[PDB]
Amino acid sequence: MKEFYLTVEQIGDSIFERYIDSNGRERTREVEYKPSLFAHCPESQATKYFDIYGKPCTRKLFANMRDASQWIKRMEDIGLEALGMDDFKLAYLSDTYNYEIKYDHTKIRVANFDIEVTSPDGFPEPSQAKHPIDAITHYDSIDDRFYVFDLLNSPYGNVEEWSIEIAAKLQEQGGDEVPSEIIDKIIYMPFDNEKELLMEYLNFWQQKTPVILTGWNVESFAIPYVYNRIKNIFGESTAKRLSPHRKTRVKVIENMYGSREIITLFGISVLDYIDLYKKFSFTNQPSYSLDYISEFELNVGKLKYDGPISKLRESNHQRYISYNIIAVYRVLQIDAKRQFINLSLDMGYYAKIQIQSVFSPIKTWDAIIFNSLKEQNKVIPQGRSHPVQPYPGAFVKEPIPNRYKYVMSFDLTSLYPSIIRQVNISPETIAGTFKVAPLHDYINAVAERPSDVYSCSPNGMMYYKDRDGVVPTEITKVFNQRKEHKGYMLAAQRNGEIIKEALHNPNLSVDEPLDVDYRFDFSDEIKEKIKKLSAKSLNEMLFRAQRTEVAGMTAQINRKLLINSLYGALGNVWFRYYDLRNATAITTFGQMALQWIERKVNEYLNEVCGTEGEAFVLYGDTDSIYVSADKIIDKVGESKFRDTNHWVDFLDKFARERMEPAIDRGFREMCEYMNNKQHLMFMDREAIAGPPLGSKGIGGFWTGKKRYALNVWDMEGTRYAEPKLKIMGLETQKSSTPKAVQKALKECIRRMLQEGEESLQEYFKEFEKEFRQLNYISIASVSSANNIAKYDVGGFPGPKCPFHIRGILTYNRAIKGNIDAPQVVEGEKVYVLPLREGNPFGDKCIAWPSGTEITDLIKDDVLHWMDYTVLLEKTFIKPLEGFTSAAKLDYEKKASLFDMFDF
DNA sequence: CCGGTATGACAGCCGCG
DNA sequence: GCGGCTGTCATACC
């Protein structure tokens, strides 16, 4: 076991480092680290240090870190480059850990915790911490225990002690249904007053100081609340004790709407799971509360309870504590499934960064490049300031709004990283420029060949073809490492496949499993010894083969995340290797790539189908094209297929045997045209879409850019048993659309694509007939409540006040003076309903808090004055009219066809 | 340094016998 | 009394 770091920090002239030593003990170092930086020298000086341009550099070794930083300032003032790693934590990490870091998670203290604060005032602001903390649950990964700190006496009540016996019983029995997996792991400790609880929490914290601190919302609530509460009661000194190094910083995050405060605790890595989830789940969610996320991932959700949470400790303290325990457990259950902390650990040690820096593609890439360049004796350039300048981005084709019967899609693989490698784009790789013609001209191969000597992008940039680029090289590494780890993973699974055959009939022997590497396939010497081994040993071989498979995935998805990060970093002015010209070279090349192939696919299909000038490519967005396949079917006739699977087979074969070769030679022409270093434009078939054979369905339609629906039978080789709707952009995918309406519109779209017009019309009619019988919650729109006060003038709407905001103000006037009525809060989500004119309320609409029923003190009148006609038109009929117009279908039996013209 | 390329709901304005 | 704008806001996705 070789030693690894936990946290690193710079305080004045010292690095403070937490680490696990070569014996496995957690330890702390103070090091007066001596940094090196670099300046340019004359050719006469014999150094081994060269910058990325091959210019000689001299190494300046500093007495301390403040001198290095002051030297940087003096170089800026003189106007000469100061080269080298200016974040001395990274340099320190690279010097102390100059090898492939292998870590052991079991020795890393990972804490997740959750706080409860009874507040009759509303949401208790963490910057004020006005109210007692009346519960803390704190899970420690090393102990494997939940530590529960419970306040028995507060201004808001004196309560009984929580019962673990009651907590384990069923909900039918008065129990809390706390799972038996964690019941034997709760360490319960009650307290007579807040001061005792808080001081015991602090001492506990010093004995078990988190390396990684997590939990749902910990960074914007729990941490700032605990810190400020302790601060207000005991003083700043006592609050600083939450940092291993007694150093804290009050950071004010100034988001482009308001401002909030987070507290930096020096010597701890905070990885808020809500940010970890938003960063690595890659699934857009209507809500990011723990409830919605828990039920999505675990199909269980957060614990239920009666009445407002501000009254739960008074009325049912038993529930209150258990609810706090389950909350922490939900976060752990999610992490058991998604494993985002491991992910963070793996990448942090890979790049050799502070773990919390995994949230920064810039820091990560900076460190990866810095490190490999260090080991070649190369010197990184000074980070330079650049003005934020918008540049061309992705090409999106304007589609003709229509129905499309048969559609086949194709994707460029890793487009932008591929373009970097193909063209050899890198700061030190710029060779010159050429007179640029219109993009159109390069797309049609009419413009003159830019260069015979250099590799080119159509923004006018030229790059050396000999030199290996710093950025292209570093990204190629990551590519290779991914294939490598995926090569171990498939072998680790296929090695377990042979093991499962031996699971049928083994024979007992007192021995341990033989020495094998599951990263590579078994030899015939090992294969003969498979059946001979014991039943105990074969279950351990299956254990370790699967353990090898888990090591592969984490490695290969991390590398995937880097690949998809690089462009982002390269487009950022704060990135060391950023160059505006290079950025636009990437996107512009991408724009040409997609349209040149759209040309090639159209030309190939026209010739093969006999026709001329017809548009086969109906749509294209960034890296993907969508191809109309109607003519390819009509060439064979649709009456010649036996079932749906037949024509799906036909199109599948046709793409692979006819179209993909046409594409490959199409891009090779483009590579030769731009004189690029290597050909890396590869395209995979994704989707085959169309209507069921012998049905009246239309298969698919586009209404605009990024707004379409397809009936998909196959996605990249995998054939679906039942057809799957792919819907992008449409109201069905919007969280603001009422629940019943999202359902009704999806069925409308299903009927259009699979069943046809008559089906749609029968449904629409019926839904209209039955609309008034649906629940008022299921037919209400949802919105976010931003800037309430801005449009609020004495309890009434002001200039430019949005519709939902108006609704909120109608509600507030209706509940004015009623404290027990649910309050509408800034930032939160609201239900919105239109109201009939003449209503006793103020306005044309009302809005109440989402996820809840309206107060009974207003419910009857809301239900009475609800404007069904307006609600149906606004949320259902109008968006449907959009779909049907584009698909050229009627949703109502007799609609005039002169409605479709601009008279 | 933990947002491009998009569409749609809606407010409010402008010409218009 | 309503298209034809512009502007604010809301929510999608790679």
UniProtKB/Swiss-Prot annotation:
InterPro entries: DNA-dir_DNA_pol_B (IPR006172), DNA-dir_DNA_pol_B_CS (IPR017964), DNA-dir_DNA_pol_B_exonuc (IPR006133), DNA-dir_DNA_pol_B_multi_dom (IPR006134), DNA/RNA_pol_sf (IPR043502), DNA_pol_palm_dom_sf (IPR023211), DNA_pol_type-B (IPR050240), DPOL_T4 (IPR034749). Part of the replicase complex that includes the DNA polymerase, the polymerase clamp, the clamp loader complex, the single-stranded DNA binding protein, and the primase/helicase. Interacts with the polymerase clamp; this interaction constitutes the polymerase holoenzyme. Changing L561A: No effect on the ability to recognize damaged DNA. Increase in probability of nucleotide incorporation. Replicates the viral genomic DNA. This polymerase possesses two enzymatic activities: DNA synthesis (polymerase) and an exonucleolytic activity that degrades single-stranded DNA in the 3'- to 5'-direction for proofreading purpose. Changing L415 to A/G: Decreases base selectivity by several hundred fold. Changing D621A: Drastic decrease in the efficiency of incorporation of dGMP. Changing L415 to G/F: Increased misinsertion, increased mismatch extension and inefficient proofreading. Its EC number is 2.7.7.7, 3.1.11.-. Residues 248-264 are annotated as: Beta hairpin. Residues 103-340 are annotated as: 3'-5'exonuclease. GO terms for biological process: bidirectional double-stranded viral DNA replication; DNA-templated DNA replication. This is DNA-directed DNA polymerase. Substrate binds at S414, L415, Y416, R482, K560. The record marks D714 as: Essential for viral replication.
